Structure 1
Amino acid sequence: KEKWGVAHIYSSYNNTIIHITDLTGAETISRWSGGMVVKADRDEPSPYAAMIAARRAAEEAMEKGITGVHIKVRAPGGSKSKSPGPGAQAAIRALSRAGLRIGRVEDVTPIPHDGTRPKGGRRGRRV
């Protein structure tokens, strides 16, 4: 019988996290990061590491009995950036290739209607 889950994709400028849950999101099936498939800090946000982590999570989910996946993609947001990193699309392509069927795609980045003051000071970063 068809079994559906959700895939949360947290993508920042420094790392990517692919986390598969049931539909309620209350039960975890497979959670992989880009800091487990490489060992150099400067390559965790790589679309390659994203592809790899997504492939492994999809393998485990399939073995556990999950055939379909809805997607929820997420930049950090809030007072931080609202644009996702370069790993989300690669992760989605990897999820599709691994054999999982894909359903609805949605963006669930949090946006303030208005928000706590952001960290850089009045001037911002200068280097």
Structure 2
Amino acid sequence: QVNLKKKEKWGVAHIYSSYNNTIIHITDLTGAETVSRWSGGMVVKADRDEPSPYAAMIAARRAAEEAMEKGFTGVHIKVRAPGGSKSKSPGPGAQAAIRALARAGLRIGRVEDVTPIPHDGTRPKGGRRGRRV
């Protein structure tokens, strides 16, 4: 119980956003201790509705209120679209979730598109012609 004068506790919200779901995941400043992890698939029951900025805001609110219960007055943001051979655009859930966090009242610090981009590229799926849908 260190004598905390500031009560400016800062954590990190890692936001995995894709075209199929979104995961809010709040940790300490390191990232090695988790404090809240909420998903579209927790907050709803329709798979097609998992990605939505609706239910993204809800997952964000639940994770936020849990974290600001536990302390953590502010959060840095690390939004992450899927990997290198997959898509490199996050989705709507990202901006929706950061807006939801600000609404919840956590001081949003610095934001970063921490998306793993390859300097080479493994082969992506779909084959030579892609998805012929």
TM-score, structure 2 as length reference = 0.93
CA RMSD between the two structures: 0.7
Alignment partner, residue 92 of structure 1: 98
Look up the SS of the partner of 1:42 in the other structure.
helix
Stretches of structure 2 lacking an aligned partner (at least 5 in a row): 1-6
Look up the SS of the partner of 2:43 in the other structure.
coil
Stretches of structure 1 lacking an aligned partner (at least 5 in a row): none
Alignment partner, residue 131 of structure 2: 125
Q: 2:54 and 2:76 mapped to 1: Cα distance?
A: 22
What's the offset of the Cα at 1:51? 0.3
Alignment partner, residue 55 of structure 2: 49
Q: 2:119 and 2:84 mapped to 1: Cα distance?
A: 10
Q: 2:8 and 2:52 mapped to 1: Cα distance?
A: 32
Paired positions, count: 127
Q: 2:69 and 2:130 mapped to 1: Cα distance?
A: 48
The 4+ residue runs of structure 1 with deviation greater than 3 A are: none
> What is the CA deviation profile of residues 78-97 of structure 1, one whole-angstrom value per residue up to 9, with x for unaligned ones?
10000111110110000001
Q: Which of 108, 111, 116 does residue 102 from structure 1 map onto? A: 108
Alignment partner, residue 80 of structure 1: 86
What's the offset of the Cα at 1:117? 1.0
TM-score, structure 1 as length reference = 0.98
* Percent of pairs with identical residues: 98
Q: 2:41 and 2:55 mapped to 1: Cα distance?
A: 8
